[PDB]
């Protein structure tokens, strides 16, 4: 609800200064509630101790997660899910919570009210886990389709990162669809952008003559 109220208590939460379980549980409930309502900078800071207690025990995660639920049609709660997956351990996490987050991400992917970085963050963390439920990647071939309809120079690096990161999408024709978009959008020569395109294409051995000539013209 209030961002600055809970930020000063992080130093007393990561270290067991507040040895009481209930006090840190209420603090973590407030932190999870505000995690949806953050800026682009405090998102990194809030997850520093929360990742540790999330790694500690799935029941500790659930005691706070049920206190503050997660919605998929809202950008802020979609983020809440994103840093949930950020803090979710790759090993000490029950597959039920993983599937619940997967369903939330599915409904959010069909919502698309989230900010542009939310999809990248959620997909990166899902790939980091990668233990179960690749069904999102399934729906991904539609989402990467929808972005391909607009596919402006700003969203193109994120779209191709999403495309070339998923193992199921490595050989999908939407790669060629975005490839022809790159040809049509060859007038944009932003160095960091083309760096991202190169870091996306090099993930696989993608070969396309039009990309080669168009990229090597400049």
UniProtKB/TrEMBL annotation:
Q: State the protein's name.
A: Mitochondrial RNA binding complex 1 subunit
Measured against the full-length protein, the chain present covers: 1 to 218 of 872
Gene Ontology biological-process entries: cytidine to uridine editing; mitochondrial mRNA processing; mRNA stabilization
Q: Name one GO molecular function term.
A: RNA binding
Q: Which domain of life is it from?
A: Eukaryota
One cellular component (GO) term of this entry: kinetoplast
